[PDB]
């Protein structure tokens, strides 16, 4: 493609879904979770020129972080936290950007990915009560 | 919408909605209300270049408050705003940070966070009572 | 003008000052502080080519310091401690200058100003036994 | 040779193995480890343009982390934590990469190897339930 | 002049004292001070192309200080301690030079001042058991 | 010579040994010590463009680091504990690296050299059941 | 003197006057040996490039030392010196940092300080006996 897919870390459970749109790149994230589950349960995301809401999970979590990215801003540093195995989940997103911004989200305690790097372009895993599974895409 | 930028309105849908902004004009100073007793931010105050009124929202009720004054050539660099989610939501604290090194910090950042977009800071939007219901940032494009 | 006002901050008490000389910057400072209070009491300014010294407020405080600046010196970095309220007054200053010189004065327990920056020209606002209210003025 | 050969650490036990691709890089690597054994247990490397995982070893690990690299990233800080001796075994690892990418995986409580940099080409050494000894291989 | 004179700060005790030599720069300044009496008591100076020693004060104190400056050496950051009023004295000196040399001598319990900066030419003030008040001299 | 000899530290004990070879740099560099004795008790050295391995001294030791070494690497900074006197011991080796690699070997409770810094190429000192004394030599 | 610089010797006026200095040479290698139960240094040893000869001064009997090896073009960018001041006085400590970014510390710095001339270290020069009771730095000009 004009793609590069990061791997999805976490389970093979939930509904799948792939958030992309041609010429588009992410302009916000969101990313809810819980303390008491110490999981993602819900990703929100908004391309530029397009004022839907792209969402999958369910957003019971007590917490989320929102991060705008400004259209000529990459993402230079990008760790996924989950729990591995057939019935996987994501745990945590922590996303650094090249104007120093950053985010994070959730829980780190069990497995990691350091994904690739670049312009952030949308969004696939699989979701239901909580997010299964998450892999990044990034222009080439 | 083609020379601004809308960061997104964080906290509740609850008081009265406001949008200080002013043709051909950014945010000379801003002054952050909050108080320890409630965790959340209570008043806000803005004035712009070229332009003498304050324009105020919510109820200057905090024990604290913080001015941030920015140079005309100044930028907003870094910016996190705290808030409470849901329908009930408050924003709860705001950090900014501009392209001379300066910084301000109000309230409490427990709950959510959105770290916005950047660039010149041209007026905030959102809604208040006795407390920031809701804040959103306006940059230049 | 050729100036620009930062806020006056602190209350509304004490006698009126102004200190500002056509043609002239501010070469030294004095801030004046006490322990016992938590306040600043006092402050002296000297101008360029001025041998005055323009005071205000009662010098009654256990510490001052002084920040000497060259001509082509500017503030850089500027936060002014208050109490806020008709009742209020200034607790405390910090200044760093374009040459990496700072000072800083009294108490920062309740409200903080990050003022202008730019050459400092002269201050405004009100003092007694106390300074009630201060104000920077910087050269457009 | 065209190949820089890391220092093979660990123990000489395990089956052998060497994983390279003339004209290919390592787009993908994956560690598996343990807290009950304080191992590395398995590992897993794609080659670029190559759908297919080469594994080692016995992913029986309550914790991974998988590094992807970019086509021009390089590593610019390798740590290998081990067990020395003929029963030596490796214990950890730690990337570093010239994008500021870093992973860390297992154990450093024994010995270490500071390796050679550069791109990272292939993996060598030797796997059975764990990880008995692995050497990195780079690009001149 | 070719002169800036930093303010003199202490109080108006001692015998005056200026330490200046036409064309000339401070190559060597030592500080004596006291724990007993917290206070500097004693400066002594030499200029280039001068081996006379310019002293002033009573060497009493147990601790002493030198600075020696190269020919190209600017003062870039000077800290004087001091007690203020009439019956005032310094107390402690800071100097930090361009070549990222520093010397710290005696307290700063009381009041500061951050003095102008540049060339070290000379020194001013009063001076009899104890340093009364100082006052540092630059180049234009 | 071509080589600049730092100082042996340690004792006059064990059989000599000097690891050098024409044309050639160390590319490999291994240290083993205890935490029974605090002594380094072996080193290892390989050069570029030969397979031998130039050892010396007990590998006794419940600890070894491994420092590998780009032909383009320096030592940009060296420091060697040991014991002084006839009777002494070399007990630690920290090297930092031109690419920002560093290894820590050992123990540094006693005497210390902050040692000649360049290109790395070879070894010099006595060993037995310890390391008795070690000098590194570097190109000119 | 046409080609020297003499940092001031500090400490007392005791033990036995030494110059370390080779003409066209530089210090390659200095060793300062200290105790903790006297707070002073007791023996210096000093090398010259081109030279086999160890230059030495004091009684080593200090339970400390520190070597400081110096590349031919790598000067003395910080140097202090601590020391026991008036006619009875001992030198307690130095501290250099070079060019290069390599820093040694010796002994104490309890009473008195210099910081001195920097540039290329030529010799020093001082005096000795149980301990080092006075140290000057010597430098090309
Ligand atoms: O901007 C927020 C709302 O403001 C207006 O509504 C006001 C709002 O004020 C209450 C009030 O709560 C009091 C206690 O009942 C409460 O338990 C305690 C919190 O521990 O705080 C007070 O003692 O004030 C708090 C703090 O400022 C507010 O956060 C809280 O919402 O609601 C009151 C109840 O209806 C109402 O009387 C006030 O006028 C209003 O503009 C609304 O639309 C805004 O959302
Ligand atoms: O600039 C500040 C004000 O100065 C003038 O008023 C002065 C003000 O001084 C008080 C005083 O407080 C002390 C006691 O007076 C007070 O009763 C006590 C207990 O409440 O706390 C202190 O001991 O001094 C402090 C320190 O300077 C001041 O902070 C405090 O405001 O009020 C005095 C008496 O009411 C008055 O005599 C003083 O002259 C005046 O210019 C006023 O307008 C200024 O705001
Ligand atoms: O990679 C290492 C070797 O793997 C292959 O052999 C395996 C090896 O597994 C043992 C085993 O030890 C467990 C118990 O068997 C042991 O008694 C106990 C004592 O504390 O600790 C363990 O519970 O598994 C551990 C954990 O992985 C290994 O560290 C350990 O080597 O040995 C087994 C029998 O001796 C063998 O059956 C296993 O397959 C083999 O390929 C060998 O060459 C490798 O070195
Ligand atoms: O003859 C000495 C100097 O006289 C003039 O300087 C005066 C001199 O007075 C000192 C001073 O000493 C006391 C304290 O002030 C001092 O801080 C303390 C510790 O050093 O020790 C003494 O207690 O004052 C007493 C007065 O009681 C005098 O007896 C004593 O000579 O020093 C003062 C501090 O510098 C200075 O202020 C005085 O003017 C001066 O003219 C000088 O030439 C003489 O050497
Ligand atoms: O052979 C005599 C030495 O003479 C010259 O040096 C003298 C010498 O004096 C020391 C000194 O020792 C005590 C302390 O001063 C010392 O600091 C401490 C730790 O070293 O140990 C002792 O307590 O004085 C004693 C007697 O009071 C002498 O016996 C002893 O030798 O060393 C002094 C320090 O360098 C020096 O100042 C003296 O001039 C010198 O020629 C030396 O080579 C001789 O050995
Ligand atoms: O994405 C998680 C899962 O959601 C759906 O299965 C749900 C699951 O909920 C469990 C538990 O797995 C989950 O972590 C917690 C908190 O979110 O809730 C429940 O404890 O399983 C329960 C019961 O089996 C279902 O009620 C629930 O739907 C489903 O879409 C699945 O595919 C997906 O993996
Ligand atoms: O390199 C040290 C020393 O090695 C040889 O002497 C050995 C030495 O062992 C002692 C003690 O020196 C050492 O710290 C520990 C740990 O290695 O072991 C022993 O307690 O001294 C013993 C005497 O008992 C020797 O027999 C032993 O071989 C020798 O090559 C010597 O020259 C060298 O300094």
Chains 1, 3, 4, 5, 6 share one sequence.
Not at 24 to 50: A, M, P, R
Not at 122 to 128: L, N, R, S, V
């Amino acid at each position: 493609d004009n793609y590069i897919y990061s791997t999805e870390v976490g389970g093979v459970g939930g509904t799948p879904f792939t958030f992309m749109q041609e010429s588009g790149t992410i302009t916000s994230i969101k990313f809810n979770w819980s303390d008491q589950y110490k999981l993602l349960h819900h990703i929100e995301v908004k391309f530029i020129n397009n004022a839907n809401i792209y969402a999958t999970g369910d957003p019971k979590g007590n917490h989320e972080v929102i991060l705008e990215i400004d259209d000529d801003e990459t993402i230079i540093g990008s760790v996924i936290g989950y729990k591995k195995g057939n019935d996987g989940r994501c745990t945590g997103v922590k996303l650094t950007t090249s104007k120093g911004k950053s985010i994070m989200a959730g829980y780190f305690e069990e497995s990691l990915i350091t994904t690739y790097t670049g312009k952030l372009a949308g969004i696939k895993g699989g979701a239901g009560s909580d997010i299964d599974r998450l892999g990044l895409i990034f222009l080439k």
